[PDB]
Design a protein around this ligand. Structure first.
Ligand SMILES: NC(=O)c1ccc[n+]([C@@H]2O[C@H](COP(=O)([O-])OP(=O)(O)OC[C@H]3O[C@@H](n4cnc5c(N)ncnc54)[C@H](O)[C@@H]3O)[C@@H](O)[C@H]2O)c1
Ligand SMILES: NC(=O)c1ccc[n+]([C@@H]2O[C@H](COP(=O)([O-])OP(=O)(O)OC[C@H]3O[C@@H](n4cnc5c(N)ncnc54)[C@H](O)[C@@H]3O)[C@@H](O)[C@H]2O)c1
Lengths: 310, 308
């Protein structure tokens, strides 16, 4: 009865999850493509020790899109505090187990989707682990998603190995059929770019005639985007990905409580200055509004979803 | 539909229940929480919960889900701290932590696995099983008892104020048939029966009470036991009004199976009819086992014999 606009979203952990939780209530068909380059935490140990892609960002996305009883949702988010076992998320372990059974991370994700009554298609950026590397300004290379920000040098660029990393066929079809393509929100260097740099994905995005919106970071991240303005974020996407990837940039152009600023300053994070002249000079549209809530600083999934569709 | 309550542990209870659920019966399974070996044991110690393993298997035996979800629940990690653990155990452990209550966790997993029946733990807290040997020494822990290389005189449970669930006692009260076993005599059947209040409830019940006797001995537990030795042990621990009929495999076993079991110092339980009659119980004897190279009860035949 309703024509649902097809929307594809690229991201990682918490930014994607917050947005999807709201976007799923709109009249849209969602495809979420989730980075498999992380190597920290429970996800990272399971990645190394079981030889599977890191399941953590996928797990959160699945929970965000799930429609199950509150108890099952808690079960899936349960984190062991004792045991070898200590630190692991039960939902990661479920994903791990399903991936072992099927020998296929993408089939595992789709089986968990059925179990969690997920409305939408969740896909990994690749069916195998990706390793993220950072080239610093001095030319040195730091390897591993969670190691890059601890280098205390400035990132010049990031890139992925294995070089013959492949996206899922379904992923490329999703981009082809997309009415809207949303990039972010998430870490620039550790979530957005590791998705966009999968071979074939930029090419597919460029050929698409969908509207392409980049949801800009609201805060800098220490060791990743120290001192970045909004245009610095967009510039980095363009330098890695070329033209035809971003049409409009969505930015929080209003102020932030002093208490929140203070709390983020303790982690050497500060607000991303919105520099409108420089953004217009990069040739994209600017969607500026009150787009964040304090919940910690998160995007307002409803306002953002509605801005990306109106 | 007849109300049937079954007492057991691991594989024997699981094999029976898989068949019995297909009959017109309402099943209550009461599962030992005294085990301390394997993944179950490590989780028991490390997370301070009752051992989830025997319950996991019972839940899978009664489940009605797609084969994939069943495999997921039975998945065992081979690498990782994590290695050796069953994902189904981990699921029960997580649910128990969230609800702070093992029985409620089991009931939540029952809904998720579309379980046909009520699965209850023997108690909502861990039970420690102790074995007093003939020499008077005590060996503590379910998985240590058989390794003692001495002969068991009796077993008993701590904590002393171990309590069964109210729902368990109701189940016994309402039962039309009460089935004891199959399972290890000293590490599955007795640890269920000895929970304070359970034998009293069974004795008060007028339900028919059938004991499914072990087909094979177990080294370090029931070496040399006849069928009457098994029943006598139940009677010595539990008194009268617990067993009306004993169900036994009175027919022979393939030589290759005997040989495979003899490698583990296990041998067939000799059915001594005269001594069984002397203990005052009825004997239901038939071909009740099937052969992998492993020896299991024929759930269908057994189910039908106990419902007659
Ligand atoms: N979640 C969203 O809708 C949202 C929106 C826009 C941008 N982003 C961007 O994604 C990037 C990565 O985000 P993130 O997941 O690391 O979140 P974050 O930058 O808001 O906080 C960092 C993460 O570590 C913890 N944390 C560290 N510092 C914190 C702080 N000062 N206050 C509260 N929690 C803190 C939190 O658990 C959080 O997940 C950030 O630059 C952020 O601005 C997220
Ligand atoms: N499952 C049933 O329907 C059933 C039937 C009759 C008796 N029982 C009794 O319950 C008691 C304990 O049962 P159990 O689970 O330890 O079963 P078991 O006695 O058949 O074998 C021991 C366990 O280790 C394995 N195993 C060890 N030795 C084996 C052998 N050599 N050949 C094949 N498999 C072997 C089995 O899979 C089993 O889990 C035994 O006395 C047994 O006879 C169970």
């Amino acid at each position: 009865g309703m024509k649902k606009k097809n929307v594809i979203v690229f991201g990682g952990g918490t930014g994607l999850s917050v947005l999807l939780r709201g976007l799923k209530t709109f009249p849209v068909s969602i495809t979420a493509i989730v980075t498999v380059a992380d190597d920290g935490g429970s996800s990272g140990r399971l990645r190394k020790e079981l030889d599977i892609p890191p399941p953590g960002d996928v797990r959160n996305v699945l929970v965000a899109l799930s429609e199950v009883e509150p108890l099952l949702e808690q079960l899936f988010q349960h984190r062991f505090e004792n045991g070898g076992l200590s630190g692991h998320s039960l939902g990661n372990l479920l994903l791990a187990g399903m991936t072992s059974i099927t020998g296929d991370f993408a089939r595992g994700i789709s089986e968990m989707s059925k179990v969690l009554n997920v409305r939408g298609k969740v896909l990994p950026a690749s069916n195998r682990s990706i390793i993220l590397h950072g080239e610093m300004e001095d030319g040195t290379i730091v390897t591993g998603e969670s190691s890059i920000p601890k280098a205390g040098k400035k990132i010049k660029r990031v890139f992925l190995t294995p070089k013959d990393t492949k996206p899922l066929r379904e992923g490329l079809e999703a981009i082809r059929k997309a009415d809207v393509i949303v990039i972010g929100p998430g870490s620039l260097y550790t979530s957005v770019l590791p998705n966009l740099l999968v071979p074939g994905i930029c090419e597919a995005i460029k050929q698409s005639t969908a509207r392409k919106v980049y949801i800009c970071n609201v805060m800098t991240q220490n060791g990743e985007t120290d001192g970045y303005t909004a245009s610095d974020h967009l510039q980095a996407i363009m330098d890695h990905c070329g033209v035809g990837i971003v049409d409009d940039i969505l930015v929080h152009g209003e102020p932030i409580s002093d208490t929140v600023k203070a709390k983020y300053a303790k982690e050497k994070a500060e607000p991303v200055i919105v520099d409108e002249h420089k953004l217009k000079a990069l040739g994209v549209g600017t969607i500026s509004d009150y787009f964040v809530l304090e919940q910690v600083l998160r995007h307002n999934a409803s306002k953002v979803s509605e801005a990306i569709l109106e």
